[PDB]
Design a protein around this nucleic acid. Structure first.
Length: 65
RNA sequence: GUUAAGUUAGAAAGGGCGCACGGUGGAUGCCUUGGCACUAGGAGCCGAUGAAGGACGGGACGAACACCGAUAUGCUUCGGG
């Protein structure tokens, strides 16, 4: 998904992207705490996706100078 | 029936010697995951762009070892497989 990450422009790669993933992780952890989640690999894959987005943004910023 | 006299003893409450069968306890034999002494090549410094060394944390489900820092049991890119 890294290529698709590059294709998006910078604001789109943070605004309404690293925010929806954050809120989804929040809801997922709430459901797990309550006691009804079933599928549990979602947490790990969401966290990995967030890290990917942050790293590509930082790479762009570093290359900009 | 009465005198007189001899006797292995022969019993064993328990004990000694020999034999048979067990229990505790880790010598001996066999075996290495760890060490000891060297040889031939390399490398002989790290740090304010924050060191050597640590504290606290990170997993779906506890404590500990190993691994990693709010991008936390991991992220990109180039090669091997």
């Amino acid at each position: 998904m890294k290529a698709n990450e590059i294709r998006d422009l910078t604001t789109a790669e943070i605004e309404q992207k690293v925010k929806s993933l954050k809120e989804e992780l929040f809801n997922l952890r709430f459901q797990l705490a309550t006691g009804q989640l079933e599928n549990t690999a979602r947490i790990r894959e969401v966290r990995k996706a967030i890290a990917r987005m942050k790293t590509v943004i930082r790479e762009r910023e570093i290359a900009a100078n």
